[PDB]
Design a protein around this ligand. Structure first.
Ligand SMILES: Cc1cc2nc3c(=O)[nH]c(=O)nc-3n(C[C@H](O)[C@H](O)[C@H](O)COP(=O)(O)OP(=O)(O)OC[C@H]3O[C@@H](n4cnc5c(N)ncnc54)[C@H](O)[C@@H]3O)c2cc1C
Ligand SMILES: [Br-]
Ligand SMILES: [Br-]
Length: 455
């Protein structure tokens, strides 16, 4: 309808990428490569006007909007099948203040670009763990990493946003402005508009003592029991996480471990590094550490470490869910399907959150399950588009085989066929509450390609 297309390009200094321009089959590809979808319009917005135009445009056309910052939607929400892609990867500017300990970042940032500007001043705020993950879809779901047990979720450090809502208007959501919207972006997602800016508190993070070993699966059941036990009685500065996987062919690992399911235990001490080598070594030798690696490295080097760059996988499938305990038998059943790992890319991720996250009132952010400390995540990953079921089944037949021991679920780990879990994840009180926020701000559900909340 060239009536709309007419004055869009009038107010659009960015770039449009049609299904004919050469760079289309590469701009419609996202990080989860099981997603062969074909949009009809790519907008690489470059400023807030570029977003308001596209959102006004995409309204005045009725196009299924897929918004996109980093592309790491483990459900494929960042590319639509025939709509418009409001792409923000070039909204990537950052302002950092050494003395205000304030940061300010556009919505298309990657974590690495954010951790590189703040660490120029020996600063940081908690965010994800892999650097090319986008800052948008992560922060709009809560977002956790190594700083989270000490400094909380990313939403706990967010002071204000700038958001472009469905009607084509630009707001400012803080605690003194649209606190309803601010309550809902912090854990809701795109549902309520496109966020063109964030503002974070920062924290002085210097070097950290980091260690990562690869215990053997046979000694597994006690380590998981050591890990489960010790993190319930652990200080906020101890961040420990277990990843079950095939041992990479790395020269610090014996060849008689290469390819066989091991336990990768990655730990860091967010404080004085000498209390690091004390508090770390008290937990390092619960099993027999193999492939050992310790270092006193800066935070920005810790965020770029994960994971061990064997490769970046093309095809992934994840099944997540929160936990409250870890029954002795589930511990036996995660070790049951660790010896069934098919590819060296799938990980069975056991993370103990809690810390400064759990010390936050539930009804303070739209993020659910703060009082849940354990987060499990059967993340499959593979290369062969014809081995799709063997890996996808290992997640299903492992998610299910303990789905009674699970509560809720992280929205940012959801798979494509999983919109049915938005109530189960958020809970009836957060959902019912997020309903009337969408009703006010997204009264038409203009932003529907997410873990959606209908008004
Ligand atoms: C390798 C890997 C590691 C991860 N590590 C962590 C971790 O440590 N902690 C954690 O909490 N999560 C983690 N995640 C999950 C991650 O937060 C989600 O995948 C998130 O959706 C990625 O955001 P993105 O913007 O990069 O992806 P996208 O595909 O661009 O976005 C996905 C969703 O976010 C929305 N969105 C993105 N940007 C904006 C914006 N500016 N305005 C409005 N809506 C927006 C989209 O509309 C869509 O619904 C990880 C994921 C991967 C793949
Ligand atoms: Br679609
Ligand atoms: Br990755």
């Amino acid at each position: 309808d060239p009536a709309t297309l007419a004055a869009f390009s009038a107010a659009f200094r960015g770039e449009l990428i049609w299904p004919s321009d050469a760079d289309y089959d590469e701009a419609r590809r996202i990080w989860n490569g099981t997603i062969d979808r074909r949009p009809a319009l790519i907008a690489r917005c470059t400023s807030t006007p570029d977003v308001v135009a596209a959102v006004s445009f995409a309204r005045k056309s009725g196009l299924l909007v897929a918004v996109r910052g980093g592309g790491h939607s483990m459900a494929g929400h960042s590319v639509c099948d025939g709509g418009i892609v409001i792409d923000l990867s070039l909204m990537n500017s950052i302002k950092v203040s050494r003395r205000l300990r304030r940061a300010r970042a556009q919505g298309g940032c990657l974590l690495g670009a954010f951790d590189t500007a703040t660490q120029a001043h020996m600063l940081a705020t908690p965010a994800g763990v892999v650097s090319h993950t986008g800052l948008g879809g992560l922060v709009l779901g809560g977002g956790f990493g190594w700083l989270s047990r000490k400094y909380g979720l990313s939403i706990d450090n967010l002071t204000s946003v700038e958001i472009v809502t469905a009607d084509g208007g630009v707001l400012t959501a803080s605690d003194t402005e649209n606190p309803d919207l601010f309550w809902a972006v912090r854990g809701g997602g795109g549902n309520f508009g496109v966020v063109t800016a964030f503002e974070f508190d920062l924290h002085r993070v210097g070097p950290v003592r980091f260690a990562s070993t690869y215990y053997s699966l046979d000694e597994g059941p006690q380590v998981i029991r050591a890990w489960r036990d010790h993190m319930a009685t652990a200080p906020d500065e101890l961040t420990w996480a277990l990843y079950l996987r095939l041992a990479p062919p790395l020269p610090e690992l014996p060849a008689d471990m290469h390819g066989k399911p091991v336990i990768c235990a990655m730990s860091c001490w967010i404080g004085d590094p000498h209390e690091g080598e004390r508090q770390l070594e008290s937990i390092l030798h619960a099993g027999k550490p193999h492939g050992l690696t310790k270092a006193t490295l800066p935070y920005r080097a810790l965020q770029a470490y994960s994971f061990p760059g064997a490769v970046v996988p093309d095809r992934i499938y994840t099944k997540s869910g929160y936990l409250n305990e870890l029954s002795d038998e589930a511990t036996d059943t995660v070790l049951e399907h660790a010896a069934d790992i098919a590819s060296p890319f799938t990980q069975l991720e056991l993370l103990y959150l809690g810390g400064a996250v759990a010390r936050v009132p539930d009804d303070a952010t739209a993020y659910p399950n703060r009082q849940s400390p354990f987060v499990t995540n059967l993340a499959a990953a593979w290369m062969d588009p014809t081995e799709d079921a063997r890996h996808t089944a290992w997640a299903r037949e492992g998610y299910r085989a303990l789905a009674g021991h699970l509560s809720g679920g992280y929205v940012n780990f959801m798979n494509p066929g999983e919109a049915d879990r938005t109530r189960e994840a958020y809970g009836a009180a957060k959902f019912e509450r997020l309903q009337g926020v969408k009703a006010k701000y997204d009264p038409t559900n203009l932003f529907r390609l997410n873990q959606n909340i209908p008004p």
